[PDB]
Amino acid sequence: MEKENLIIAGKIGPEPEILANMYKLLIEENTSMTATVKPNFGGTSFLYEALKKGDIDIYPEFTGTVTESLLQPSPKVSHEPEQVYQVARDGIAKQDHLAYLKPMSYQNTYAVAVPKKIAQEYGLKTISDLKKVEGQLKAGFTLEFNDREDGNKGLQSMYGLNLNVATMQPALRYQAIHSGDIQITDAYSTDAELERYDLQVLEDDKQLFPPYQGAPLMKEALLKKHPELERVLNTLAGKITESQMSQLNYQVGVEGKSAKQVAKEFLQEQGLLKK
């Protein structure tokens, strides 16, 4: 009886798809609940509004994204990842009555990336160095990174950078930078494409980017109906290194492995999942 089915969605990319499947695997093993993973469901605003509306039940959301996009007005937060989690978790519960579980260990930050030869040619080590060459290089940014105060709007406001920006589909920006039609893109720090395409991440010297740790986001009402979801999904808390998540992304995004299988093998190897 009562085999309730949860909708777990992810933002664009292998990582949310991997994360969502880990949520499904954990949920189905340890609760009387099934789960459906919705890969590549949308961007932050869509996932967030889908959650509040009940179209989805869980998705992995990132701490700095809670503080910077989701919370309005955005609070001025530190760079301590734990403090940023607490503001996110308390802020989003007050604002929208969403429960935000404990963050995973790794950080997946927005990272301004250039090909390694571009960085050598133009002497680019930090984001500030782009001011030197903002009239020579072409940037390709996701639409969301463009519109985000911690994205390109913050490249303008904090760095003074007025880059020549073309808004890209997320999956195209990496092929553009590789083939040469753009020279700057908004990478995600754990993206396998960084290592695969000789992309060098420019250092965030003015510290525009907040901490970004992922954790399940969910209505508080769902957590009251199923309190076991907190214990169950929190076995991921403080776990998964950038190196581990990067390898998982390689497997799904580069090797074409199934995200469920990659998540499953990993949770099993970590002892987080039977067999």
Ligand X SMILES: C[N+](C)(C)[C@@H](Cc1c[nH]c(=S)[nH]1)C(=O)O
- Site residues for ligand X, 127-186, by CB under 6 A, read 144, 170
The reply to whether 266 sits near ligand X by the rule CB under 6 A is: no
Of the two residues 12 and 202, which places its CB atom closer to ligand X in the complex?
12
Beta pairing class for 98-100 and 34-42: unpaired
Strands (E), the chain: 5-11, 34-42, 58-62, 98-100, 110-115, 138-142, 164-168, 184-188, 199-201, 214-219
Q: What residues from 12 to 71 belong to the interface with ligand X (CB under 6 A)? A: 12, 43-44, 62, 65
Minimum distance from residue 170 beta carbon to ligand X (Å): 6
- What is the CA angle 201-42-252, rounded to 5? 60
Name the minimum Å distance from CB 108 to ligand X: 4
Q: Closest CB to ligand X among 44 and 251?
A: 44
Contact 258, 252 (CB under 8 A): yes
Per-residue binding letters, 215-254, with ligand X (x by CB under 6 A):
----------------------------------------
What is the β-pairing status of strands 5-11 and 34-42?
parallel
R_g of the chain computed on alpha carbons: 19
Residue 188 binds ligand X, judged by CB under 6 A: yes
Please say which residue, 11 or 173, places its beta carbon nearer to ligand X: 11
- Contact positions toward ligand X, by CB under 6 A? 11-12, 43-44, 62, 65, 108-110, 144, 170, 188, 212
